[PDB]
Design a binder for this molecule. Sequence first.
Ligand SMILES: *[C@@H]1O[C@H](CO[C@@H]2O[C@@H](C)[C@@H](O)[C@@H](O)[C@@H]2O)[C@@H](O[C@@H]2O[C@H](CO)[C@@H](O)[C@H](O)[C@H]2NC(C)=O)[C@H](O)[C@H]1NC(C)=O
Ligand SMILES: O=S(=O)(O)CCNC(CO)(CO)CO
Length: 303
Amino acid sequence: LDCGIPESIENGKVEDPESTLFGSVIRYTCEEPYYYMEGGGEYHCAGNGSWVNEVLGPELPKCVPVCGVPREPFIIGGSDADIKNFPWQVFFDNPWAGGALINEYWVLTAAHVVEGNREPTMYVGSTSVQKMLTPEHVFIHPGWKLLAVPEGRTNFDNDIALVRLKDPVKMGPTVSPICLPGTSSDYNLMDGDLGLISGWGRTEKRDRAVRLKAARLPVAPLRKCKEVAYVFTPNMICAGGEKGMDSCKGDSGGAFAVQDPNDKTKFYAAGLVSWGPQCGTYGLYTRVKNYVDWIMKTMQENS
Ligand SMILES: *[C@@H]1O[C@H](CO[C@@H]2O[C@@H](C)[C@@H](O)[C@@H](O)[C@@H]2O)[C@@H](O[C@@H]2O[C@H](CO)[C@@H](O)[C@H](O)[C@H]2NC(C)=O)[C@H](O)[C@H]1NC(C)=O
Ligand SMILES: O=S(=O)(O)CCNC(CO)(CO)CO
């Protein structure tokens, strides 16, 4: 007749129970607004002594991260940004680069960032580069050309990699994932579509930025990037061309964040900073939509 004090769950809590006896009810709530429940979270104390929920039975709820919604709305020619504006931003200190958290155990980045560093040290939650995440394994896309001499690379096709983390990342005001693009035609970018870039790369005034910078740039026809040999493919998005705003050395791997077409309050990773012919002109970004199948397969098979 006593179900006992209910067990807590990670990233959520159980409201203080009024009673733990037969017929009492308790409710689990996730830690909002950073997490949501994977129910309604209500359990009653059943006659067999278990706390039971209509959908989960005696199993406890799972709180999963909310993706793509910064706590505070918001690189050459950019401006100071707070990590709260781009909570999905990840910093790699060797080589100096970025990435995007896509869930509690995975970070998306450019293959060129991790090709020579299969155990990358990564940092999240701070506006300045001056929490450390530990990698479990780095998965480089199989279409990435590995080179004996990476400097001088001219073929950045398929510049994408995933980093699986050893421990789950705790979400909060400064750390949260960005959404992925869907596979429908609603995720086909068009000329002029606006996206945000963020990073600690070179600026017009310093070789690298100590504090996060960001800029809003429009997508442009691939021809623009070509008119600034290097390989250009449909797996690349061209963006920039306005007010000298562009991503630069040290920003590689960061997400080109675009407002989700179905939900204006969230951002998704439409591109990843890859390379560019000349800082301050047009830049090339890996087109994330083209890799969604591989990203999902990799995460599912390595869970
Ligand atoms: C006790 O029972 C639940 C199922 O709850 C009973 O049935 C329910 C509709 C509501 O009438 C409750 O008040 C009843 O007590 C067990 O639930 C099952 O748990 C197994 C695995 O353990 C799970 O495979 C089945 O899906 C669950 N069933 C459904 C209805 O939720 C529960 O295991 C029991 N606890 C104990 C100790 O035997
Ligand atoms: O399996 S996925 O990589 O998600 C789809 C194929 N992507 C390519 C990349 O060159 C086409 O855009 C083919 O590997």
